[PDB]
């Protein structure tokens, strides 16, 4: 698959920041509303990262004014404009799906700081 | 329907296969040539040859890592003391299969699997 490997890496964006699950992340996303092309922000804990080159996703979980939301993002989509890491987070797993069962003080991730 | 799956099942469950290859790898390291069935030889390659390559690099973590697999201490003496420095330049291909007929008891296609030196 040098054809496919050569063909996908022509599309991979270069400046994707290094983040790992547990991190609070603001993701700025192009949202189109008719003619105006707005850019809105989705901040939450990374609970899952799939690395597959171009087909790399990451799931961000927010508790939005009420109930909880999980956006899975394709990392190399042109929709996903910015990824910035707000708070670096210290966890032990690789997929943090237990946080789907926890709210508030139980869903509280220590900071990494190294 | 199996498409691209690897690994014979050998009419055993997973723990009996694991145990069986642990014994049979121990026997091939011990005696340097054993007679088994042809499928059990062909799976014994994929169990035995990784122990030789682990033995090509002697350290406490590889002795313990080759004692988790194989579970015998004489075996991880011959690996790391004899076989690992024996091959040492041989990149894969530590063992050959030689087909040798059929059993009498059940007409199974036997094969002698042996290490690839045995220059003694």
């Amino acid at each position: 698959s040098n054809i496919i490997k050569q063909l996908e890496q022509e599309q991979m964006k270069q400046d994707v920041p290094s983040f790992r699950p547990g991190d609070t992340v603001e993701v700025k996303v192009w949202v189109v509303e008719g003619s105006k092309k707005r850019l809105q922000a989705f901040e939450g804990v990374v609970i899952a990262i799939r690395n597959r080159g171009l087909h790399s996703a990451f799931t961000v979980r927010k508790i939005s004014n009420g109930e909880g939301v999980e956006r899975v993002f394709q990392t190399h989509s042109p929709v996903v404009d910015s990824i910035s890491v707000k708070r670096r987070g210290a966890v032990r797993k690789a997929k943090l799906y237990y946080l789907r069962e926890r709210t508030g003080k139980a869903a509280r991730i220590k900071e990494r700081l190294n | 329907m199996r498409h691209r799956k690897s690994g014979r099942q050998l009419n055993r469950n997973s723990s009996h296969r694991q145990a069986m290859f642990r014994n049979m790898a121990g026997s091939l390291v011990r005696h340097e040539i054993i007679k088994t069935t042809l499928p059990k030889a062909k799976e014994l390659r994929r169990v035995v040859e990784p122990l030789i390559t682990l033995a090509k690099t002697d350290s406490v973590a590889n002795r313990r890592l080759a004692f988790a697999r194989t579970r015998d201490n004489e075996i991880v003496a011959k690996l790391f003391n004899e076989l690992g420095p024996r091959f040492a330049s041989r990149a894969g291909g530590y063992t050959r299969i030689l087909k040798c007929g059929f059993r009498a008891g059940d007409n199974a296609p036997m094969a002698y699997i042996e290490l690839v030196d045995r220059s003694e």
Binding site: S1, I3, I4, Q6, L7, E8, Q11, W30, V32, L54, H55, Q74, H76, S77, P78, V79 | M1, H3
Partner: protein, 209 residues
């Protein structure tokens, strides 16, 4: 028009500029080179026979090698044949490239599908399973009844029963061609085409409107 013989390289996606992922299948289409031209005056129908790829010298037989040697062409991995469309003209030894699809806008892709072996009627024919409990005695995935009673006292032809699913010619129609890349010899079509990776495809222009 005619088609070209490809090879299923696999699947990827193509992010558009406005952020719409398109699932594409990559089909490497090398130089299909014409080995025979067929006319009404000798065969009753106008069609070209093309070959593609390359074969080992010791693996091509003497009949086959004599055929490609007459054509004045390197032996490929197979011979295929395309029916011609009344104003088209090809010569023997002419090479045909993916550039032919630089206008076509939508194609039909024909391959052999993945062989699923002896399949039961729930996989094969989408029969619905009977109860998994509530008394049911050894008949969960079985086909049920297969016909009527004394009248007819036969099972009709083409009753849906279990047997070999997969591994047969299927054509997927009207796939949007996303890119034609004459440099790398590639054709990116939108969607899944039949076959495992590396299988030989046949990409023609779409006959539907």
């Amino acid at each position: 028009m005619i088609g070209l013989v490809g090879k299923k390289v696999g699947m990827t996606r193509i992010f558009t500029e406005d952020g719409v992922s398109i699932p594409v299948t990559v089909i490497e289409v090398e130089a299909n080179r014409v080995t025979q031209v067929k006319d009404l005056a000798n065969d009753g129908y106008r069609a070209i026979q093309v070959t593609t790829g390359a074969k080992k010298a010791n693996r091509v037989t003497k009949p086959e090698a004599g055929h490609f040697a007459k054509a004045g062409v390197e032996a490929g991995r197979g011979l295929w044949e395309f029916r011609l469309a009344e104003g088209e003209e090809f010569t023997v030894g002419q090479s045909i490239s993916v550039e032919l699809f630089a206008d076509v806008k939508k194609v039909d892709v024909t391959g052999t599908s993945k062989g699923k072996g002896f399949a039961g009627t729930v996989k094969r024919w989408n029969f619905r399973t009977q109860d998994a409990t509530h008394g049911n005695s050894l008949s969960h995935r079985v086909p049920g009844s297969i016909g009527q009673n004394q009248t007819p006292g036969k099972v009709f032809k083409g009753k849906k029963m279990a047997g070999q699913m997969g591994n047969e010619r299927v054509t997927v129609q009207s796939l949007d061609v996303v890119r034609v890349d004459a440099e790398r010899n590639l054709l990116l079509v939108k969607g899944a085409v039949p076959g495992a990776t590396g299988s030989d495809l046949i990409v023609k222009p779409a006959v539907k409107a």
